[PDB]
Design a protein around this ligand. Sequence first.
Ligand SMILES: Cc1cc2nc3c(=O)[nH]c(=O)nc-3n(C[C@H](O)[C@H](O)[C@H](O)COP(=O)(O)O)c2cc1C
Ligand code: SF4
Ligand code: SF4
Ligand code: SF4
Ligand code: FES
Ligand code: FES
Ligand SMILES: [K+]
Lengths: 263, 45, 432, 214
Amino acid sequence: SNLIEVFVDGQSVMVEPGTTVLQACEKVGMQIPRFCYHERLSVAGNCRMCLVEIEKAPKVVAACAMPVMKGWNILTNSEKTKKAREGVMEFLLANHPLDCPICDQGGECDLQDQSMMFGSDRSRFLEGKRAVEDKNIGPLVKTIMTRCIQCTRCIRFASEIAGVDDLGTTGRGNDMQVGTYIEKMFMSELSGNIIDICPVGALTSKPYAFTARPWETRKTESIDVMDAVGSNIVVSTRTGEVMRILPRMHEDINEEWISDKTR
Amino acid sequence: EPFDNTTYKNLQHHDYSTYTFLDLNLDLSKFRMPQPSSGRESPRH
Amino acid sequence: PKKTSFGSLKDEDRIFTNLYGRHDWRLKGAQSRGDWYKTKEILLKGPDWILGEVKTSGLRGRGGAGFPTGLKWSFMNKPSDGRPKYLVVNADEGEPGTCKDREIIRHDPHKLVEGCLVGGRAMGARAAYIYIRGEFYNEASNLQVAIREAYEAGLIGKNACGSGYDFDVFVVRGAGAYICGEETALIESIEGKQGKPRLKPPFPADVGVFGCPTTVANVETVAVSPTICRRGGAWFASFGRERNSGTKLFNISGHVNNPCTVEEEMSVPLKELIEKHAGGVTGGWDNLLAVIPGGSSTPLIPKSVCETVLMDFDALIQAQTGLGTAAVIVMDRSTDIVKAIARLIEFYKHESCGQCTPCREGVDWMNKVMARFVRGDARPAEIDSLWEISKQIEGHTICALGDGAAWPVQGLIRHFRPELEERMQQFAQQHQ
Amino acid sequence: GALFVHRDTPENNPETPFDFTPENYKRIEAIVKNYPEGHKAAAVLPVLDLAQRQNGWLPISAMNKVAEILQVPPMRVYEVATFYTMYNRKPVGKYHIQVCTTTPCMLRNSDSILEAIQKKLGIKVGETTPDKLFTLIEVECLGACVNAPMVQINDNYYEDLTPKDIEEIIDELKAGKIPKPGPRSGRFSCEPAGGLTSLTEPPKGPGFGVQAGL
Ligand SMILES: Cc1cc2nc3c(=O)[nH]c(=O)nc-3n(C[C@H](O)[C@H](O)[C@H](O)COP(=O)(O)O)c2cc1C
Ligand code: SF4
Ligand code: SF4
Ligand code: SF4
Ligand code: FES
Ligand code: FES
Ligand SMILES: [K+]
């Protein structure tokens, strides 16, 4: 075969040419941190949370973007790798606001969970924080953009999945912002799906705002009946009351998306 | 013809208007060779 | 016997013989100084021979990185696969303290346009885009005039120089961004997107501008290319030390008696270069405080090192700095060193593209810290904090702008820590 | 200041009248041909520059016009307008003065140049005069570092300025003249101020140094 052999912490694994470092680690049950990499979108490589050390190399490479070369010993838990995650996670939380109590994402937030698994336990940031103004993009997706971590998942989803080149980045530097630049409503049959991909509380469901917390909801894997596609969904209840609807991944039907009517 | 090293020979840029660069690019069109074709009118096609 | 002292470059060696614009810069003027001479005969020797001359001459990229130019341009030297191949010239002169590039297009435009043809034929390219920064409107027009003259003289276009090789040259102006000097971010602007660098791989020699193979070269490393072929690569290598050979343009600026751009030889001593051409340090050489050798992306060095350091890549690397763009910025005793470097950080903070995390959220963090150091509104325990913050940016970024913004801070903390701590004491006791 | 989100106003809104003059359209017809077919989006920067020259700034209507003629999503033109800094999204004075203030131009006392310009016009940085003749802003390195201190007005570099030298140009501009570009110190270009030190010899003729093999 054309399979190449590479080592993940010394463990041999066979991969096809052009496989990325991040995909190599999945083959052996290892999951690299990530904020910008989504398996169903473009590759952005602009969060640097997936930086990984390659043995006998002086630099740490972006696992999500870097294709793997033959006989690379990937060190997913070396000291250099650990200090790359700690450094990056320190920059994300520098200007992030203290909204966890009043943030809808709280309890199911990738910034929160990966902070406690890969980041430090305190902060050495003494300066003031950046503050961005909200942007109205419709009656479904609420925007509180001070929490955006400029990952571009929303930008890449709308352009490629929903085919609506209406979201983008404006400015540059620490002031770079994500939005429409004008009073525009992101109204598409797949509009609600940007809520899920957004790893933080910048985008959240507006109808669902403030009603429940992730840990107190019971999940029921059911089917959608709003159309003939039969999208797999997870119905969330709390005290016998339906609270929200989430996609349930199925490769052959709906990938991991659902339409606004279902959602 | 005599060599004089005490005078500035770059004196044409004191009177460039606001469309000089574009006009020169326009004038350099008939000389250009035909461009290659990607095969589609745009990546959105 | 190879020499051990460098400098005193004889004018018959200086490649840029119209550096100061004291002679006609048009085609007739250029053709009276060896430009566009036997250019055809160079082309018909083949791409390998042209690269062999550059490869043997020991040339290194003059844009700041300093990689070997012969090896780089050899990546293009592979048979096509159904796509164009392009040579992109980086004239986005935006590095602070650097003005050498502005003096080549404006005064020796034809020498560059001769380089494109020589370089383009070497790489097998079909046309050259020249990226000239937006603020250089007048310089771009001069370059445009030269291109038209060459087009009407048969020196480019269809059947260039009579050699049967077609080669077009286009000049595209940037709309204003220091980051657009980066080789990949420069490619994005040509494509019409924002100027945000790409990750690597792929390298531009695989997927460059418009997705076709592309080589990005600085104006200086491309202007001298025809002369290397004409005068032989052996002649070029004779200057500078081994693996540092050639002549370099230098911009001496700041606290010097006579700031100037002068062409000299590689490995020239810094003290000799300043005193010989720049008229010495203002107030006498003992007034020297620090020097930034290669523009601003390189760490500064204190006076004690400036008295014996040669101007080349390896010697400056041995001094915990880098040759960079060879743009010497001099600072004297009257200079407030903290504020002077606190301003460089405030430059990168504005020029940061913002795409990736460390430089987007971290260069602003360093900028906010350095502002407090200027007033002394800090404590000594934060100096090591800023050192550690800088090393989290360096090497963790998409492009080198993040690397180039950490190094200025490290230099200041490395060689001038007492001034930082001295400043904080005064603020502490005053506000008491 | 300098927000990055557009809001509709009576004088700046998508119904504002803008259109390239037919002479500009001919120029655009040649800009688009510098790029391969199917990659016509590469003309966004030059076309946005051309519109700014016609109008002096970019209203929201101008950006949409560039998008319409190049078949580009409107948001992809708003990204470019806010990214590069030479695109003026708010009206500017008749003369946009831009005082460099980076370290090389700071070491040579640009602050005095900046202070002098404010005093002559009585406007703070970033402001425009009541008559809409001048707009003053600080900028980063402009590439004329050896000729510091210096400013740029519209398209020209005035170099080696001193507080008296700059105030002359403003007076010349306020009279409707076209002040000469280039340094105002006694030198012409990047050459040393105190007499040359290199190239003080006639340039060698064609064929000098050509190796025998070639
Ligand atoms: C932030 C940044 C700014 C840069 N600006 C320039 C520039 O203005 N001119 C230049 O020739 N190279 C510049 N470079 C270096 C280019 O990326 C690239 O290394 C070089 O232009 C390639 O040509 P070379 O072979 O001569 O090095 C810059 C790099 C960075 C990271
Ligand atoms: S996005 Fe996550 S980390 Fe930020 S406030 Fe919300 S829950 Fe907390
Ligand atoms: S809004 Fe959310 S998905 Fe979009 S860039 Fe910001 S963090 Fe990423
Ligand atoms: S280091 Fe800064 S300038 Fe370079 S790609 Fe990252 S954010 Fe952009
Ligand atoms: S997940 Fe790789 S850089 Fe974002
Ligand atoms: S520092 Fe002002 S022009 Fe370079
Ligand atoms: K979310």
